[PDB]
């Protein structure tokens, strides 16, 4: 116990902090897409709330989700992490009437579809960038429907919410499971179309349940400390149970999720690191201790 | 080597994943200082240079070489980081005259012994404000003459820069021996000052040997990284020798200074780690791979 711990901890820790470093080289890398895609649509990325730093958290979470992978190999996923925002603020606010909520919903799920944005709507434009950089990029062949129907789940589940806000509250497990709105998993299928080859694809449905998954580790650890903040009128997990339910939610979906990936880092390695450091550094950023 | 490789890694990454979101929350909390610093004197810190972008990258620095510290505890470090930039950019270029540069100089020093800043100096005043912070904040007593020969160190080394500068240029070896004026060892000794105990005072001598280590370990990281730039018309150390030098001199430095902090860390295990983790995390993030 005592002379059990190690007496040396220098040079670990050297390399420790040289790959932290070189993560945070890759992040600022990151930014310049970011800042060129907010650019192109200031409609949909208002300056108040999204400064350098959103842009920089955003880049960072990305970099140490997936710290092998270059820049432009993260440019999909920041993105589409980007859109997921953007969507979320104009049915989060801007929407008024249950039938612009509606109709934002199908536009996105049209462009998703392969077809043109109309001339006004910003985030369909958007969307149909990613789209096609996805066409572009996309290391497998047949990836539409699965990326089509992430976007779907995702459109589904936020519509929802806006029902629920505005409705005389669902039960914490509804609630759970309708975490696609947070966004996670429409941009780990975005992410896996450009960079993985024809075995991801192969193992893309037990990938997809994993990411789920993970989504809902996502949420309750994203809850857990946005409380104040939606305290906004948003929903938030801990109206549905209390502190200790979710914590221990969270303690108990964590431990579960590393067994399933454990499991399935012998089938896709690169994807299930992907997964666990997702979980891992939103976790941690989100808990701030 | 085949079947020797680990067959498991999410487990961990997840570990590490949540550790390293854990510090970037650490250096998000860290900023608002900075932020408050800049704030208090704008005469230094100039906007187009300074965008939060560049207290986001100092304030992931500080928080990944010393993750154990508060924000509090490393607000320190970071503000005297901070002056540090500050000093240099009125003597990389506000300055003109052999005597701007002397009176500078001068008055910090004479601010660093105590005496009270000039009302039209606010590098003076931030400098005094650093301090009061260390004089309320020091961990032990006696700490005024080594930080003093810090700020000593520092001010003559940028003063010796500024002739060579203007002069009709140093061979390598004396531009390494002028590394003082990178401000590595002022920023280790004040944060050494308010995070150490009579431990640290006990050990300092050997520990700021080896922060002089760790500081021409970093000249040569910043130097190798930063050629184009001052390509600014100032100095940097492949001009002195071609790249495969300064490279190899790296990596000697690198393997020297590590085998010393492994010999340290047994007498100061925390100022040690804190040492190698800034080595690394700079060596890296320079780098930049």
């Known amino acids: 116990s005592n002379a059990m711990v190690p007496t040396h901890h220098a040079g670990n820790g050297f390399a420790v902090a040289s790959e932290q470093g070189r993560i945070c080289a890759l992040a600022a890398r990151g930014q310049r897409d970011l800042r060129q895609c907010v650019r192109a649509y200031p409609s949909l ?86 789209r096609d950089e ?45 975490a696609d709105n947070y966004g996670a998993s429409f941009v780990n299928v975005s992410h896996w179309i450009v960079t993985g080859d024809a075995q991801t694809r192969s193992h893309l449905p037990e990938l997809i349940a994993a990411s789920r998954e993970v989504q809902r580790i996502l949420r309750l650890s994203n809850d857990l400390a946005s409380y104040e903040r939606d305290i906004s009128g948003d929903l938030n997990a801990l109206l549905l149970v209390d502190r200790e339910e979710v914590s221990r939610q969270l303690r108990d979906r964590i431990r579960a999720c590393q067994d399933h990936l454990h499991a399935l880092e012998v089938t896709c390695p690169r994807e299930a690191l992907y997964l666990a450091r997702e979980a891992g550094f939103t976790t941690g950023f989100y808990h701030g201790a």
């Open 45 to 130: 990325f208002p300056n108040p709330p999204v400064d350098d730093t959103m842009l920089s958290a955003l880049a960072l979470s990305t970099a140490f989700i997936a710290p092998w992978c270059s820049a432009e190999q993260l440019r999909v996923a920041n993105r589409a992490s980007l859109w997921v925002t953007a969507e979320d603020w104009q049915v989060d606010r801007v929407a008024t009437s249950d039938d612009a909520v509606r109709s934002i919903v199908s536009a996105c799920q049209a462009v998703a579809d392969g077809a043109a944005p109309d001339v006004d709507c910003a985030l369909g434009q958007l969307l149909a960038e990613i």
């Open 134 to 178: 996805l066409a572009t990029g996309a290391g497998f062949t047949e990836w539409q429907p699965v990326w089509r129907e992430e976007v779907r789940r995702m459109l589904t589940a936020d519509i929802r919410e806006w029902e629920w806000r505005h409705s005389a509250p669902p039960s914490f497990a509804e609630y759970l499971d309708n």
